[PDB]
């Protein structure tokens, strides 16, 4: 029972709002064509650099510092790729058929093909990117999901199975609900019926499964581009990919 | 605008209830020890046989026959492994630390180790299996999720991108919401507050992401056991695994 558990909806929101990270750029080189390695670079490079903030952003979430330190690393490394992606989709909200990676690196399904196996995912992000537009997502709702991912993705599969374990699991859940009261609130504050409020909470959350899915698939891709000596040796990024210990 | 879109909550439910498939058994052979192939068999074998029903169950869902035929195959083959798993978890609800695969094949984390890479997942299902218990899930709620998976998992990533496409996407969504009105209803009918009704809808859905996740991981496992000439050549199962076209 700490901070988070008290904050009024708006409070919750502003916090979440003010806690956001900066929109990076990319030393994008439009001078030369992207190869199944050139872009990969730009991409993995952006990722790596974004992750530094994402970690700081992390601590800024409510109730997140209240978890054990290892657990946070656990949550943080279980949901990152999703966080990168939910960010991307939002970023690319406005410009359909395009993925505003960075205000400088704006790609379309085409460059997607430059890199292998890359295409699919891109479209997966694209569609999600649309489903958001078609829903008229809202910066407030976004930040809610963003954090929700951080808290869900990985909660069930923690690092423990003891008493402090069933406590943490219980905190994360308590925070989560608070986040819901908030979400459901930003909708009353928009004039939705009760029914609409339900239905929208669903609509949103459900997407998250698709994200979970994209995140899963993307990760497989990345691990394959690494087993191809194409991915720059990025300390941080490698660390997050390794946490998944996938094959 | 067909059937589904009308059915009263209960109507929706009973339908969903009556539409359920039978709980299979397994020609389980407790006579001899399971090897990283013996069990695999039992498992993949159960899977294959369950899938026959799951397909029939499918048609029994509302609004599902209203989709194009290819799309249904699409949805059905995009969410199956999840459907098997959400089934399993429910089945194993009552007996913690155990996974009631079939009323005859009841395993624990141990046998899980018999097969390789198998352990992890098992625990993932276990925890989910618990999270359900700790929530006192309800047969009514279950069938709702079950179908919800069928409808979500794969909707965004359909087979088209034309007009009839944006229609189907629009139907599936309309059905989904109806399912939500139902869920939210089975909770009023249980005496939950408004707040509780929100919070629970979340709690449930959110899990679905974990399922999405487990389903993703499991699939990778299965495809690896196949690349190990350990998996029996099961027509149906192979077909579903192939739809994912994973690497
Ligand atoms: C990890 C990948 C490279 C980095 C990409 C990125 C990089 C930065 C960012 O903010 C979002 C994303 C989303 C998709 C990611 C890709 C999915 C497949 C690819 O390997
Ligand atoms: C597909 C696997 C074998 C079949 C298993 C099954 C088989 C039948 C069923 O009703 C549920 C499940 C859930 C987990 C599945 C497993 C996940 C990994 C393994 O390869």
Curated annotation (Swiss-Prot), chains A, B:
Lipid-linked residues (S-palmitoyl cysteine): 144
Binding site for 17beta-estradiol: 50, 91, 221
Superkingdom of origin organism: Eukaryota
Consequence of substituting residue 97 to V: Destabilizes the receptor and decreases its affinity for estradiol at 25 degrees Celsius, but not at 4 degrees Celsius
Post-translational modification: Phosphorylated by cyclin A/CDK2 and CK1. Phosphorylation probably enhances transcriptional activity. Self-association induces phosphorylation. Phosphorylated by LMTK3 in vitro.
Interaction with AKAP13 as annotated region, ranges: 1-247
Stretches assigned to the NR LBD domain: 8-244
Post-translational modification Phosphotyrosine, affected residues: 234
Residue segments, region Self-association: 1-247
Expression sites (tissue/organ): Widely expressed. Not expressed in the pituitary gland.
Places the protein is found: Nucleus; Golgi apparatus; Cell membrane
Annotated stretches, region: Transactivation AF-2: 8-247
Impact after mutating residue 236 to A: Abolishes interaction with NCOA1, NCOA2 and NCOA3
Family of the protein in this entry: Belongs to the nuclear hormone receptor family. NR3 subfamily.
Subunit structure as annotated in this protein's UniProt entry: Binds DNA as a homodimer. Can form a heterodimer with ESR2. Interacts with FOXC2, MAP1S, SLC30A9, UBE1C and NCOA3 coactivator. Interacts with PELP1, the interaction is enhanced by 17-beta-estradiol, the interaction increases ESR1 transcriptional activity. Interacts with EP300; the interaction is estrogen-dependent and enhanced by CITED1. Interacts with CITED1; the interaction is estrogen-dependent. Interacts with NCOA5 and NCOA6 coactivators. Interacts with NCOA7; the interaction is a ligand-inducible. Interacts with PHB2, and UBE1C. Interacts with AKAP13. Interacts with CUEDC2.
Disease (UniProt): Estrogen resistance: A disorder characterized by partial or complete resistance to estrogens, in the presence of elevated estrogen serum levels. Clinical features include absence of the pubertal growth spurt, delayed bone maturation, unfused epiphyses, reduced bone mineral density, osteoporosis, continued growth into adulthood and very tall adult stature. Glucose intolerance, hyperinsulinemia and lipid abnormalities may also be present.
Comment, domains: Composed of three domains: a modulating N-terminal domain, a DNA-binding domain and a C-terminal ligand-binding domain. The modulating domain, also known as A/B or AF-1 domain has a ligand-independent transactivation function. The C-terminus contains a ligand-dependent transactivation domain, also known as E/F or AF-2 domain which overlaps with the ligand binding domain. AF-1 and AF-2 activate transcription independently and synergistically and act in a promoter- and cell-specific manner. AF-1 seems to provide the major transactivation function in differentiated cells.
Function per UniProt: Nuclear hormone receptor. The steroid hormones and their receptors are involved in the regulation of eukaryotic gene expression and affect cellular proliferation and differentiation in target tissues. Ligand-dependent nuclear transactivation involves either direct homodimer binding to a palindromic estrogen response element (ERE) sequence or association with other DNA-binding transcription factors, such as AP-1/c-Jun, c-Fos, ATF-2, Sp1 and Sp3, to mediate ERE-independent signaling.
Protein's name according to its UniProt entry: Estrogen receptor
